[PDB]
Design a protein around this ligand. Structure first.
Ligand SMILES: *[C@@H](C)[C@H]1/C(=C/c2[nH]c(/C=C3N=C(/C=C4/NC(=O)C(CC)=C4C)C(C)=C\3CCC(=O)O)c(CCC(=O)O)c2C)NC(=O)[C@@H]1C
Ligand SMILES: O=S(=O)(O)C[C@@H](O)CNC1CCCCC1
Ligand code: NA
Ligand code: NA
Ligand code: NA
Length: 158
C-alpha cells in the first residue's frame, strides 16, 4: 500500500546514495512521531532491534518546536556529526547508532509537514554533494505526492 511505496522510496535513496541506513519519520498531530520504515545495509541491525536493547537520551525537540527547521522547508546536511556542534545528548544518540554523517529533509503532503526522510552513513565522515541533496529532495517530494494521492483516494470512500 503505502508500505511498498515507503519500501521502494527507502531502497531507492539507499542505492542512489550508497549509504548505510535510510529512514522515514512520520509526525503525529501533536508533532510527536516515529520512524515507520527503514532500508538498511546487511552489515547493520534493523533500527527496531537497536531500539529494543540500546537505550537513548529522550528527544522531544521536534515535538516541542512543532517540526523545527523542517516546518520552514529547511534540511539538515551533516558531513561529520563529531564537528557539527550538537548537544551532548544528540551526539551521544547519533554515536549509539554509529551514525557519522547524515542528511535529513522534510516530506510535505499537500502544504503540511508530514515527516522526514533521512539518509545515514556510519563510521566515516562524508562530503555530501549538491546533486545528492537535490535528488534526496526530489525523492522526498515524490513521496509526499504519493502519500497525498493515497489520502485523496481514501477520501473517495462511497
Ligand atoms: C539532546 C537529545 C537534546 C535534543 C536535541 C536535538 N535533537 C534534534 C533533532 C532530532 N532528534 C531526533 C531523534 C532521533 N532518534 C533516533 O533514534 C535517531 C537515530 C536515527 C535520531 C536522529 C531526530 C530524528 C531529529 C531530526 C534530525 C536530527 O538528528 O537533527 C534537534 C534539532 C536539530 C536541528 O538543528 O535541527 C535538537 C536540537 N533533543 C532533546 O530533547 C534534548 C534536549
Ligand atoms: O537551528 S534551530 O533553531 O532550528 C535548532 C537548534 O537546536 C540548533 N541545532 C544546532 C544547529 C547547528 C548544528 C548543531 C545543532
Ligand atoms: Na529511536
Ligand atoms: Na543538538
Ligand atoms: Na535523522
Amino acid at each position: 500500500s503505502l508500505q511498498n511505496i515507503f519500501r521502494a522510496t527507502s531502497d531507492e535513496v539507499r542505492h542512489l546514495l550508497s549509504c548505510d541506513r535510510v529512514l522515514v519519520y512520520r509526525f503525529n498531530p501533536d508533532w510527536s512521531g516515529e520512524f515507520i520504515h527503514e532500508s538498511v545495509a546487511q552489515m547493520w541491525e534493523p533500527l527496531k532491534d537497536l531500539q529494543n536493547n540500546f537505550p537513548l537520551w529522550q528527544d522531544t525537540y521536534l515535538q516541542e518546536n512543532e517540526g523545527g527547521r523542517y516546518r520552514n522547508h529547511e534540511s539538515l546536511a551533516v558531513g561529520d556529526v563529531e564537528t557539527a556542534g550538537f548537544t551532548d545528548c544528540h551526539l551521544d544518540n547519533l554515536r549509539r547508532f554509529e551514525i557519522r554523517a547524515f542528511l535529513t529533509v522534510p516530506v510535505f503532503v499537500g502544504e503540511q509537514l508530514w515527516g522526514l526522510l533521512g539518509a545515514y552513513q556510519n563510521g566515516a565522515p562524508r562530503h555530501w554533494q549538491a546533486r545528492e541533496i537535490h535528488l534526496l529532495h526530489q525523492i522526498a517530494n515524490q513521496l509526499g505526492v504519493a502519500v497525498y494521492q493515497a489520502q485523496l483516494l481514501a477520501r473517495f470512500q462511497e
